[PDB]
């Protein structure tokens, strides 16, 4: 008479993340109209790449001053969205919800010295599996690119994605300390009465940057 069915075991537990919709309760409501509202974003990575955000160097500042000493290294850090330098960027902030990532990270450097200061900077990228460079001469053998201060104050440089795997973890493991993704090093080739002038730096997603597999890992 009635259509037999087999109510199967192992199915239809509530699963916090399952696609199915729930059963309606109260009907026929019409929202107030909200078309052509301003400022909409439909993807966090569109917001991540349209809007670069500051890096955090020692003493808690977004810039890195020049130096009148034999040392040339302005900064140097693990390439890790978990990095301390990244820790205040929007991009790092968003990556903490996803377990792996891929693709290019941009890195914008804006010089902000007086019109009479001048400088050359360099930015190498040293892949993992060897100590990172301490000097520009050495780092010259990396994927570097090197610019100088002028009428155009900004300079953007993509950090290339290079890994034996197709994706790469967003977070560090407490066991691993040798840095699995390699380093970026920002040097200072020369400067001209530039001492005490700041080079503010900012970071965003590239065209091809992508995050994946969300996860709530406490993450405050």
């Amino acid at each position: 008479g009635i259509f037999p069915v087999a109510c199967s075991d192992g199915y239809g537990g509530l699963v916090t993340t399952d696609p199915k919709t729930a059963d309606p309760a109260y009907g026929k409501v019409f929202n107030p109209p909200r078309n052509m509202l301003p400022g909409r974003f439909t993807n966090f990575l569109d917001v991540a790449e349209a809007c670069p955000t500051f890096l955090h160097f020692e003493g808690d500042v977004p810039y890195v001053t020049t130096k009148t000493d034999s040392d040339r290294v302005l900064a140097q850090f693990d390439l890790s969205l978990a990095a301390k330098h990244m820790s205040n960027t929007f991009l790092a902030g968003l990556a903490q919800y996803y377990t792996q990532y891929s693709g290019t990270i941009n890195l914008h450097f804006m010089f902000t010295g007086p019109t009479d200061a001048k400088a050359r900077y360099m930015i190498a990228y040293a892949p993992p599996g060897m100590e990172p460079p301490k000097t520009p001469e050495a780092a010259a053998h990396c994927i570097h690119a090197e610019w100088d201060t002028g009428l155009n104050s900004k300079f953007t440089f993509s950090i290339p994605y290079l890994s034996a795997a197709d994706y790469t973890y967003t977070a560090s493991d407490v066991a691993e300390t040798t840095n699995v993704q390699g380093w970026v090093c920002l040097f200072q080739i020369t400067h001209g009465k530039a001492d005490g002038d700041a080079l503010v730096v900012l970071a965003s997603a590239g065209k091809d940057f992508e995050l994946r597999l969300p996860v709530d890992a406490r993450t405050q």
Binding site: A22, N31, G39, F44, G93, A145, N152, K154, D173, E210
Partner: protein, 186 residues
């Protein structure tokens, strides 16, 4: 890729600039409608619970991620584990209503009730923040209220979510050069 510094025009610089070839992006997982559509566990009041979205803990995924929008819109979908019958009164309803069973009450069934709720607030779009007051967010910004003899577990789920004007979002601040948390391992 040099450019003018103060302009605040977007300047994306591809790896092509030094040889090299931009790859294929796929971004389905960081779509707003997608990422916000999960259940998030709020800690209930024993009996009367306004269904605010701000009640979600600001550290959690759905929590902190919803907070990047200054204005949002969603339909809700609560899954609540309770004793007695559960009764949801619309938005802007006297709290005394929570007693009348004619309001969309759901009779008890093991082991949780799951129901979808319509967006019902008299504003076009709700807000995660509101400078009427320099907590302290208009009482009108809610999805209604539920009541049971005892709500124990309560879980929000945004459906159709739309979001507007992104506000900052911020990672846990490390002390060592890498925030060296212990990754799942075989």
């Amino acid at each position: 890729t040099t450019s003018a510094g103060e302009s605040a025009d977007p300047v994306t610089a591809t790896v092509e600039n030094y040889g090299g070839e931009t790859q294929v992006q796929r971004r389905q997982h960081t779509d707003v409608s997608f990422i916000l559509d999960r259940f998030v566990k709020v800690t209930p009041k024993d009996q009367i619970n306004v269904l605010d979205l701000m009640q979600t803990p600001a550290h959690t995924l759905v929590g902190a991620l919803l907070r990047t929008a200054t204005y949002y819109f969603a339909d809700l979908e609560v899954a609540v584990k309770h004793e007695g019958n559960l009764t949801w009164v619309p938005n802007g309803a006297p709290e005394a209503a929570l007693d009348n069973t004619t309001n969309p009450t759901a009779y008890h069934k093991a082991p949780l009730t799951r129901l979808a709720l319509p967006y019902t607030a008299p504003h076009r779009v709700l807000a995660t923040v509101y400078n009427g007051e320099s907590r302290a967010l208009p009482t009108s910004f809610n999805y209604g209220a539920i009541k049971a003899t005892r709500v124990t577990e309560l879980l929000y789920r945004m459906k159709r979510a739309e979001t507007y004007c992104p506000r900052p979002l911020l990672a846990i601040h490390p002390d060592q050069a890498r925030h060296k948390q212990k990754i799942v391992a075989p």
